[PDB]
Structure formats: C-alpha cells, structure tokens
Amino acid sequence: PVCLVVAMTPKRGIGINNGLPWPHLTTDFKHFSRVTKTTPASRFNAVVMGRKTWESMPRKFRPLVDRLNIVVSSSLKEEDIAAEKPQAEGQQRVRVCASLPAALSLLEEEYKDSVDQIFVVGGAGLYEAALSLGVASHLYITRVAREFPCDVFFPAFPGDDILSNKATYRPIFISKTFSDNGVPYDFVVLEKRRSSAAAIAPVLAWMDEELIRAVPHVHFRGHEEFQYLDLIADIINNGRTMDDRTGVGVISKFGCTMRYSLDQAFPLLTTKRVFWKGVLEELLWFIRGDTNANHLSEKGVKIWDKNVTREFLDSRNLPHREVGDIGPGYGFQWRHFGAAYKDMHTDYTGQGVDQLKNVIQMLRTNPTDRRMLMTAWNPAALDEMALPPCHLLCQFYVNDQKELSCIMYQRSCDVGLGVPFNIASYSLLTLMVAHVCNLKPKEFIHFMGNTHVYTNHVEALKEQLRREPRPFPIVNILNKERIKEIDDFTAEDFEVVGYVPHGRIQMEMAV
Amino acid sequence: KPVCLVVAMTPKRGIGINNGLPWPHLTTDFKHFSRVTKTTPASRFNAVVMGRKTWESMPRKFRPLVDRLNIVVSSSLKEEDIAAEKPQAEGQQRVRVCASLPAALSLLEEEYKDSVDQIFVVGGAGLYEAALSLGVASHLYITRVAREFPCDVFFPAFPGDDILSNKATYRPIFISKTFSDNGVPYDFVVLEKRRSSAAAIAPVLAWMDELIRAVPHVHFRGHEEFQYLDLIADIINNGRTMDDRTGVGVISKFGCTMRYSLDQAFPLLTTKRVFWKGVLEELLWFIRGDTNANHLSEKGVKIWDKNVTREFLDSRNLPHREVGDIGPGYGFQWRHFGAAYKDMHTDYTGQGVDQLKNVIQMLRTNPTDRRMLMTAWNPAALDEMALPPCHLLCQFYVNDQKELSCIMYQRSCDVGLGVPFNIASYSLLTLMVAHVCNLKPKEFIHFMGNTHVYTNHVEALKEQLRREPRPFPIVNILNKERIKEIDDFTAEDFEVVGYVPHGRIQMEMAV
C-alpha cells in the first residue's frame, strides 16, 4: 500500500526543464515535509523518487533527512550518489532500484519491520508506473490554481474532475486556499474507492425525540466554500416553505453567518462560475454613487434591467421614473446620504453625507474608532427606490497588525444567485479600501437576515452540491502606485489569478 | 455498588408539599424521569428505590413503576401491603420492602446481582439524606425547577448546591437549556462526585492543528448562556489589544454571533444579576421615542446620566444641549427617522419615519415581507447625537407557524456590561411585538460588530466564568387584553418569574 504526493497545475503540469514550473511554494514544501516524515514510534518513512527527480533537488536537501531515500534508476550507481557528498551519521544510505515493481520488493525484503508509510515523490515515470500497478491507496495532491508552462505531466486518472472541467479516485479531504508568490493552491487527499459519560447519555437520548448534504464523501472540509454549500444544504434540510412578493415559493432560514479569509486568496466561489465582471462593474458603479442602471446595462452587465423596466417602475408605484433609474439606491446613500434625489442625471456633488469618504478618513487617522460604518438603508427614501437594499450595512475594523476586516449585513438573501455575487462584491471592496488606507486585507464576515433558496432553483442547487470546490483565486490590484484614493480604481485595475471554477449553472432572476 | 439520585428541585431545595409535588404538571420532567430510570444497554433492568411517602404520593396507575424493580423503604409497610394494593402484571418485577437503605443495597447485591443494571434513589428527603451520608451516590440527576413554590419537604444540603441558588464534592458535568411547562421554567443538570482508513487523513491534520475556559468541567453545554460565557473566554484568549476612544485598554474581536430561544424561557442571563428594572425602563423610553435621560434618571436608572453630563455634552461639541438630552437618540429615530431635532422637550409626533409603526403593520398584514427592519443609525444626524447608537438595527421575521424571530446588529459590544443587557433588551421587544401582532415568540439572534471586553474587567470576568449558569426565567406579559398596541405597555405589565442569578460583580461604566 503506497501513497502519491504531488503538486499539480490545473492541466496536470508538474515540471519543466527538470525544475518546478512555479516560484517556490513554502507552504507546499512544509506540507510535503510533514506528510513524508510524521508517524504515530519505532518506524521511519520511505521516499521513492526517479533519477531526474533526485537530480533536480538541491545538493543541500538530498538525501531527504529522516526518510529512506530510494531512487529508481538504471544509469546511476549506488556509489556515485555516495561520492556526491559524505553521509551524515544516523540515516539509511540512498538506495537504487531497476524499476518501481522492483523498488517496493526491496522494502518487502530488507525493510519489512522499519518502514511505516511509503511515498512516491516523482516524477511522471514513477507516477505513471504507480497508477498502472494500482498499488496507490491514496493521493496527496497540491492543486496549484495557476497554470504554468510544463513539459512533464502527471497522468490523467478517473475522477480528475477535481483539477479542471472535462477503479476511481474520490476526494476525502479539501483544505482551505493558501498562497505564495502570487500563486494560489490548496491540498487535497484522494482515496482509491471503486462511566463518566455513560451517565450523561440517556438524558441526551430522550432529549431529541424528533436529508441532503454537501459532498458527502469529503470528511475533512477545510475549504471555506463549504460554508456556502452547507448553508444551501441546511436551508434545503431545515428551512421553511414560504410565499413571496415575487409570487415564486421560497424556503427560508433566519439568521445566517459566513466568514472568509482575505490574506491568502479571494473568495470567488468555485462550485459555479461567478459573474466577476458583474461584481466589479457594479461595485465601481456603487462607489461612483451612480443610480443609472443603463451605465451597467451597456457594459454587458444586465443584472439590474428587470428591476428598472417601464413595467416594474409603474408597479413599484413610480410612473415618473426613467427606465434605468434605481432611485436613491445603494451607491447614492453611500456617497450622498440624505440628499434630495431628482433623477439619475442630476449632479449630487457635495450634498448629503459621504459615508465612504468618512469611513476611510477614520480608518486612516483613527482606526480604533467603533463608528466606521456605511449604511444604504434610508427609511426616509425607501419608497423612492425601485427596490430596497439587500446588503444594507457594513462595518470596518482594524487590529494590531494593521489588518482590515469587514462585516456586511444583508436583510434578504437569494442563496443560489445573489449570495456568491455578494460575497465576492464586498470582499473586493475590502481589498480596495485596504489598499487606499495602507492596510492588509484580513477577513470578510457575512451577516444574513432572511436567507432563502427559491423553489425553482432547488433542482439546480442539488447539482451544485455534488461539486467539490476548487482552490480560490487571487485577486490582484494592479497599478498599486497610481491608485491613492477610493475613486481612483477603474475596471482594468484588477486581475483575477488562477480562477478554475466548475461549469456555468443557469438560474433565473426572480423579477 | 454505586447509586444515582434523580430529583426535581425548587431553588430553596424544596421537593414536596402535602405528600405531593409542589408545582403544576411538568410533562418534560416526567418524560426525562421515565427515560432515565428505564433505558438499559440485553438480559438486564434498572432498580428504583423510594420511601414510603413517595410511594403514597404517586398516582395508582403509575405504581409500581413499569419495567423497573421498585423498592420501598418502610417499617410500617410490609411486602404484602403492596401486593394486595394492585394485582401484579405478568412479566414485571415484584416490589420489595426494606427497613433501611443499607438493607436495600444489601438486598440488591444478595439477590439481584446479574439482574439489575442501575440503581436509582427516587425519593424522598429521608432516602436522599441517607444516600448522601453513605457516600454511595455517584451521580445526581437534578431537575432544577427555577420557580419558588410552597414546600414542606426538602432535598438535603450538599457540597455543590451552589448550582441551585446563592451561598467529597458534587460538580456539574451536564447543564441543559431551559424548558418550561405551565408557566414554570426548569432545566436538567447531572452532577458528579469528585472530591489508514481514516488515519491516512490525519497526517495533514497534524501541522494544521494547534487557555481560559469557563466551567470547563461541564462537558455538555446545552444552556444557551454558555454562548455568552464562551464568547467572553474567546475574546480574552484570542482577541487583539486595542487602545480606545476613552483611553482604557481593550481586548476585542470582530463578527461574533449568539442566538437565544424565546419559546420556552427568557434569556435574562443568570451568571451575574442583570438590572432588569433598567432594561424595561430603557426600552419603554425608546418606544415613547424619548430623548430625555432625566426621565430614566428620576426612575432609578442612571445608565445614561454619565453620557448626558455637561462635561460629556461639551466634549461631544454640543454646548446648547440641556442636561439629559441624548440628542436624536435611538428612541428618536425608531419613531421619527429623519425628523429635524430641536430639544428633548419639543413634540415630534408625526414628523419623520415611524419605523416601529411600519414594522408592526407589515407584521400584522404581510408577514412574508423582507423589508421588516428598524434602524437607529442616521449618518446625517450622528453629529447631533450625544452618542452614536451601539444597537443600530433590528430585523423581524415571521415563520410558517406565526413564529416571530428577531435579529439585532450591534456595532460595538461591551461584553462585560452591555451585552447581557442588550440580549435582554431586544428579547423583551420581541416578546412585546409578538403579543401586539398576535404571534408566538421563537428566537432572538444577536449579531455583533466590535465585540470587546475592557481590561479593567478582565479579573472581574475570569471570576464570572467560574460560575455555571442557572435556568433562565420566564417573563410574562401581564394584562394581555388591555395591551393591543406597542405604546399600550407600561412598566407594570411585566413579571419576571423564577429568576435566580449569581452575585453582583462591580463593573464601572466607561464614559
């Protein structure tokens, strides 16, 4: 019973010019070091590698300490490796075998009592040979989210859908997303599947007296998206069937919380492609305090059209609104809170309270202040809006390390559709704000009120929950030097790096 | 050889009156009792042991207790006094009569080994006194009845009776949430005498894996107050030390949640006494839309005075504010959002948005509406306020079964002093609104922004955490018929039933 341990691009690339295709991945190496060494007393592990893999290592690190180094090679001799560097005392001498079947036979003969776990470390020669013989019980895969130029590739295998879109291998473990040198990645493991408390118990047994899960197989679920998935599953399992303003039935839960890290990667959800062009163009729209939805619509972003139609504005009891007008909406309250609205064309400069500018000036001069809030809810002008704000409130926070976090409260949540859009939108705002203030982005926290999935979306969401997440992408702000204030961002100032989602899921917007 | 004791108990240790139970029928208790005495892991059954009067107090259809070996301790009653009392059913075990508890335990070993699984002393005072003296009691199953009743028979005093009320040891290993039957709150505690299948997943868990705990013995944590206790513990252990607008050192955290049930009992926290006279007077102050802190100050609630002083009013740059005037405070926006403020004496009826009216109306008519929100935060009006509202927003949610839930978001949370007050203050509003809208109260959800403990409380809080919580009380609304609007309520229309909190800890208010 052997295990494979690899780092791998989406297109299964592993090496180039007999070296790693990426810049050094410190957290990947630490993870490698730990897996290959650790043991529950008397036994050391074994690291089986090829010649090209052995050679590609730095001289400093070979032989890999505390582990039986076995090199599969015909051309290299057992003494050339011995003459390469003097051996340090306390380690088994590096062993050379003809092929991989012969390599494991060596452990059967001479090391039957000493070795605990067996690890094949590279490369494509030994990996291919390992999967051929099928003696691999487990695969420890580091999924590099970014694509890199490669000439050596890891062989494709049943259930390699965990890398990109297309005896079996099922994921049992998915870690949260890590990053090094602007390279996002995460760790997965895959399985070859094909009376101190006796007194308490009966009190618990009677105490209960009273269906769907996200990716059942995956038992350790480090990935942060699991929040959102388990949140879908929960409302499908434990929510309440409700009616609606829209006329479409709803399953709703009240009081819901999600939080996502910003320090390593960006929570652009992977289980379905997120319309990022939308979250970007809409956020810049908000920041401008723009209330004209045509400016969005023309850019290819049609998210607001149905709620600013001639038909909808009349039902929303505003016959004197122009098509495209969202009223004094999200962005208007941010940049001009309380100001007298006229139309989308009127210039509202200097009028009202610019919450966004004050939130920054507070962050930049006095970050411990507890009044760093931006609201979109104005009970005075709710009726003048074409549709009341969902994401209505957000608070900011700085710690010791000059790291920035952001809470956002949402009154009403279309989990299937709006939520992943909302996560990504505000997390982006945190990145923007953090940069302008000279702070590290840390964490984004999502507070939810009415949290609901629409009944017509339910079939599509079970489809989404069969999908195990991919590593998060990195969002980079570009022209970091050129942008100094929050209004200096443009659409081209951003870069989504290594975003490899699952295929598009179609979901109708509830009018 | 070891025995378990199973009792229900008044805070004053009372167990009986007039050879019967002191309280009305508690179904959930009798359920607990039935299951705990009966449930057994094959060829095996449980023994129940009682006094003569316990046997007599018990209704005829229930004695002897089915599926359990009954033993009555008596010297007047004989074994044939009981056999003639009711024909024995086929299969059941005969009731045995011993003259003392040592004889009872002796009989159990002498004749009933290999026969009886577990031994339960069931009552009354005499046998509970006897069992505690012998030191044979391994576990105490206490049903803490929170309400004080007329009692002539009492459970004996024991080391560890600090779980009942204020003052070889008996410490809690289990505390459940508060239940209620017939206007009576209660909860269940258990006390203890002290004086590569999945292992291939575990190596990656090694490196990823890594001080103050409250009531650490309590292995089961049903009691919803544990949420708050652990929230204090987390802030201290895992928080970051910030400086403060007041100057006093702060340990703080961002984005933490709590939720409390309102269908069984009231989350008026028990681990320290909460100033309920304040929570009631402050809320009815808000409801009236009052901005005059002297109306609270004259009534014995001085919670706002340190913030309406001439010094603080001038430090907030408001020279013309009279002493007492909070400016457009929380009460003000609730009923007059956007109204132009003058002083506390000016009459504002009709001006601004009456959010509270709109909330109740939307509730009583269109409960599936998601715009059912109230907000104290008014960016344009913040400057004129003596203090920017801490609790700034609440949302209401109505269920399938006409069940009301409420979320409240609080930007800044004094976890030592303000948080339990706020839990109490909105749970009360939720009760009030529910009655006024003809709805069953279900849940209060607390969303928290800057969640912090002051450093001149750290010592005073570590002490509090040593205290395990008592059952929650019931808050009843008196004069239900007379009250039909939210303004109809007065301080007298309420009654806190079964409140048994721990001693007061002195915590100064930060100005």
Ligand SMILES: NC(=O)C1=CN([C@@H]2O[C@H](COP(=O)(O)OP(=O)(O)OC[C@H]3O[C@@H](n4cnc5c(N)ncnc54)[C@H](OP(=O)(O)O)[C@@H]3O)[C@@H](O)[C@H]2O)C=CC1
């Ligand atoms: N991403 C990752 O996790 C890792 C990537 N790498 C990368 O992989 C590349 C090196 O791997 P690769 O190019 O595939 O070369 P290999 O590491 O597979 O080694 C090739 C040589 O080893 C011998 N060999 C290998 N497999 C067998 C076998 N089954 N039977 C007999 N002999 C065998 C052969 O010798 P002969 O010709 O004499 O038969 C062959 O020439 C480098 O670019 C390196 O950076 C390396 C380690 C980890």
Ligand SMILES: NC(=O)C1=CN([C@@H]2O[C@H](COP(=O)(O)OP(=O)(O)OC[C@H]3O[C@@H](n4cnc5c(N)ncnc54)[C@H](OP(=O)(O)O)[C@@H]3O)[C@@H](O)[C@H]2O)C=CC1
């Ligand atoms: N809430 C609860 O958990 C429970 C409450 N109760 C309440 O308690 C009351 C009955 O209990 P209580 O009044 O204490 O009476 P008991 O049930 O303790 O029975 C009293 C009789 O039992 C015998 N006896 C008990 N202990 C001893 C001893 N150590 N040595 C010798 N004889 C003993 C004596 O019988 P004799 O005189 O024949 O020798 C005595 O007269 C009822 O009102 C009942 O409702 C009862 C059980 C549980």
Ligand SMILES: C#CCN(Cc1ccc2[nH]c(N)nc(=O)c2c1)c1ccc(C(=O)N[C@@H](CCC(=O)O)C(=O)O)cc1
């Ligand atoms: C949230 C928000 C902003 N908005 C505004 C907006 C307004 C009313 C709404 N009403 C309802 N019922 N659900 C919504 O998601 C919604 C969203 C959006 C509107 C539509 C889409 C939409 O049709 N979905 C995108 C997919 C984007 C994604 O991956 O999330 C699409 O493919 O068209 C997204 C966002």
Ligand SMILES: C#CCN(Cc1ccc2[nH]c(N)nc(=O)c2c1)c1ccc(C(=O)N[C@@H](CCC(=O)O)C(=O)O)cc1
């Ligand atoms: C929250 C809030 C509203 N308020 C108003 C108010 C105003 C300024 C504040 N400032 C600070 N820093 N913390 C607060 O909790 C606080 C509270 C209160 C203020 C004080 C007390 C107080 O002194 N404690 C109570 C004891 C209550 C308990 O034990 O929990 C007392 O006995 O007076 C209570 C409520």
Ligand SMILES: COc1ncc(-c2cccc(N3CCN(c4cnc(N)nc4N)CC3)c2)cn1
């Ligand atoms: C950029 O500098 C650099 N870059 C690389 C090295 C290095 C030094 C020793 C050895 C190696 N490898 C050994 C094996 N590997 C591996 C990494 N992660 C996983 N999950 N599986 C692997 N099988 C990477 C290749 C790499 C030194 N220096």
Ligand SMILES: COc1ncc(-c2cccc(N3CCN(c4cnc(N)nc4N)CC3)c2)cn1
């Ligand atoms: C008024 O109706 C009513 N009222 C009372 C009864 C009743 C029926 C069986 C038995 C009894 N006991 C009195 C209460 N006991 C008890 C209850 N909880 C705990 N935790 N420990 C106990 N020792 C034991 C025995 C009471 C029936 N009917």
Ligand SMILES: O=c1ccn([C@H]2C[C@H](O)[C@@H](COP(=O)(O)O)O2)c(=O)[nH]1
């Ligand atoms: O950012 C958004 C915008 C809209 N919605 C969804 C949720 C609601 O179902 C609907 C708005 O309608 P009301 O909540 O106003 O009824 O749009 C979101 O989830 N997020």
Ligand SMILES: O=c1ccn([C@H]2C[C@H](O)[C@@H](COP(=O)(O)O)O2)c(=O)[nH]1
């Ligand atoms: O109802 C209240 C009133 C006050 N505070 C506390 C929290 C903060 O510690 C302090 C307000 O300080 P600023 O957030 O305004 O700085 O008062 C509450 O938690 N709840």
